[PDB]
Structures are given as structure tokens and as C-alpha cells.
Design a protein around this ligand. Structure first.
Ligand SMILES: CC(=O)N[C@@H]1[C@@H](O[C@@H]2O[C@H](CO)[C@H](O)[C@H](O)[C@H]2O)[C@@H](O)[C@@H](CO)O[C@H]1O
Ligand SMILES: [Ca+2]
Ligand code: NA
Ligand code: NA
Ligand code: NA
Ligand code: NA
Ligand code: NA
Length: 229
């Protein structure tokens, strides 16, 4: 698939193996600058290659499976320029404290729609959430191994304090097809927040609980390109 973001993204058709519930998550540290710097937070999170290669230089905290449910959070800090502990919601399947003021997080896997039609995803973040969506744009169907670092221009992005603090992505999707998805998050300092929800043209319900929507698929030899059309 093309890497470019599109309104009609390509999806994937898994084989016999049952998709596993939830997304994969990786957590990385994101240190402050040395005492007395102005500002105190590291600006690395906005380097253009930070979401591709830069984050990998940071200390790996965790890699977990099975992230699903409601993945939204709001972490309230009490002090600027200070690492403070907190916990992710239970949905993240990570039962240890981390520096919720300052960390990087990567989620990847597949989104399976329940209805065929236009979906509008709405995102917000403190500090940053970058979203790739579709085969190629995120990664290749059951070939994430060979394509994970080759994602394309973001389908949506949100940066706290910017002219784009919230964003939307509208895409036409087919029910029961599995669409590659990559979420890249950072908190630089202080409060952190992530909101990821959607609506469809089918009804006026907002979906915030991804239990029946987020899945993981094993990579395979020849891939699992979408077979529908
Ligand atoms: C703009 C700014 O620097 N605000 C300071 C606070 O830090 C920011 O807080 C926002 C949320 O309001 C966001 O989380 C951002 O990442 C942070 O940089 C904080 O340092 C506060 C300490 O009391 O001072 C504000 O001025
Ligand atoms: Ca913040
Ligand atoms: Na097979
Ligand atoms: Na740190
Ligand atoms: Na990694
Ligand atoms: Na909007
Ligand atoms: Na409702």
C-alpha cells in the first residue's frame, strides 16, 4: 500500500488464526533537561524524527500486550519541571508506577470496524499524539516486522498548546476488516492526557471503549493484504 494518508485506507484480511484482543504498547522514559534549564522540558519530542527513530534511544520501560477498553486518561501533576509518579488505567495492562509527567508511549495493532461507512476519529493530547492509520500509512498487513519504521505522513495529530490541540480523521471503512493503526504519545512535563474516540454515520453514539475494536495479528510469510473489494 501507499504510505500516504487517505480517506479510503487499505485494510487487511487475517487468516485462520484468531486475532488477539488489544494493541501492543511500548513505554519509554523521557527525561527532563538538566536542573535550571529554560524551559525545563526536553524539546526532543518535536524533532521530526522523534516518533520514528529518536524515541528508541530512550530507556525502555515496558512492552506489553492486550491494551484495550477505554484508553483515555488524564494525569494531574502537582509540580512543573519535576518527574512525578502515576499509573495508567487498567486498560493498559501495566500495573507498575511510571513517571506520568514525562514519558513516551507507542501503541500499534489493528482497528476492526463494526459498521461499513465513514468513521470520524477525534483525538486530543497533552502533550502529543500522532496517528497513522491504514495499510502502508501505519505498516503493512501482517508484515509489521518489515515496515514498522516506514510509516507515512500522519493521518491526524494533536499537540498541546498548538493551533492543532485536537484533531479529527474521517475515513471510510469496511466492517470486519482489520486496519493497521499506530498511536505515538508523549508527555514532556506536568499534566498528561490522551483522548481517542470515534463516531460513525450509523448512529450518534460515541465509542470510547475499544474492547471489540482493537486487535493484534501475527506477522506471516506473505502478509495478509485485504481481500475485499
Ligand atoms: C505553558 C506552560 O509551560 N505551563 C506551565 C505548566 O506546564 C505545562 O502544563 C500544560 C498543561 O496546562 C502541559 O501539561 C504542558 O506539557 C506543560 O508544559 C506547569 O509547569 C506549571 C507548573 O505549576 O506552570 C505552567 O506555567
Ligand atoms: Ca504535559
Ligand atoms: Na495460513
Ligand atoms: Na526520566
Ligand atoms: Na521500540
Ligand atoms: Na473537530
Ligand atoms: Na450515547
Amino acid at each position: 500500500a501507499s504510505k500516504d494518508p487517505t480517506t479510503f485506507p487499505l485494510g487487511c484480511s487475517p487468516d485462520i488464526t484468531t486475532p488477539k484482543k488489544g494493541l501492543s504498547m511500548e513505554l519509554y522514559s523521557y527525561d527532563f533537561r538538566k536542573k535550571g534549564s529554560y524551559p525545563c522540558w526536553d524539546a526532543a519530542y518535536l524533532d521530526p524524527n522523534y516518533p520514528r527513530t529518536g524515541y528508541k534511544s530512550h530507556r525502555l520501560l515496558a512492552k506489553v500486550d492486550g491494551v484495550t477498553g477505554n484508553i483515555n486518561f488524564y494525569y494531574h501533576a502537582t509540580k512543573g519541571c519535576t518527574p512525578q509518579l502515576g499509573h495508567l488505567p487498567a486498560s493498559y495492562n501495566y500495573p507498575k508506577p511510571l513517571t506520568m509527567t514525562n514519558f513516551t508511549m507507542l501503541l500499534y495493532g489493528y482497528f476492526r470496524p463494526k459498521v461499513t461507512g465513514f468513521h470520524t476519529f477525534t483525538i486530543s493530547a497533552d502533550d502529543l499524539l500522532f496517528v497513522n492509520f491504514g495499510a502502508g500509512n501505519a505498516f503493512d498487513c501482517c508484515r509489521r516486522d518489515s515496515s514498522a519504521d516506514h510509516f507515512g505522513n500522519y493521518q491526524a495529530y494533536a499537540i498541546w498548546g498548538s493551533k492543532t490541540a485536537k484533531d479529527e480523521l474521517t475515513v471510510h471503512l469496511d466492517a470486519g476488516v482489520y486496519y493497521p493503526i499506530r498511536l505515538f504519545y508523549n508527555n514532556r512535563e506536568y499534566d498528561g492526557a490522551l483522548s481517542f474516540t470515534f463516531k460513525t454515520e450509523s448512529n450518534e453514539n460515541t465509542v470510547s471503549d475499544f474492547s471489540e475494536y482493537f486487535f493484534s495479528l501475527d506477522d506471516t510469510e506473505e502478509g495478509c493484504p485485504g481481500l475485499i473489494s
